[PDB]
Amino acid sequence: SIDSAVATYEGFSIRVHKYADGDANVQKMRFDLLPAYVCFNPHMGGQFFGNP
C-alpha cells in the first residue's frame, strides 16, 4: 500500500518508496539497497606499499 519504483545503476537495483506520513504536508522518499559479502580465503590478498 505504498507507491514505489526500482532504479538500476551499474547492475545495482535500488528500491524507492514514497509516502506522506503525518499531516505536516511533508512528503517523504526512501531508497533501499541490501548487500552480502564473503571472504573465501584471507591468504589470497592484502595491502602493499613501496620499499626503500
Binding site: 551499474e10 552480502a36 564473503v38 573465501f40
Partner: protein
C-alpha cells in the same frame, strides 16, 4: 537573479573498479527466502 535555467551544473563523481573486479559469480541469488541470512561453501 530571478530567472533560473532548467539545466543543473555538473558535479563530482568517483569511479567503480573494486565491484567490477571482485568475484560476483559464486554468491549470486543464493541468499533467498529459503536459505536464511547466511550460506556457506566448502573447502578443498
Amino acid at each position: 537573479s530571478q530567472i533560473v535555467l532548467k539545466k543543473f551544473l555538473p558535479g563530482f563523481m568517483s569511479d567503480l573498479v573494486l565491484a567490477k573486479t571482485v568475484d560476483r559469480q559464486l554468491l549470486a541469488g543464493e541468499i533467498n527466502s529459503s536459505t536464511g541470512d547466511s550460506v556457506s561453501f566448502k573447502r578443498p
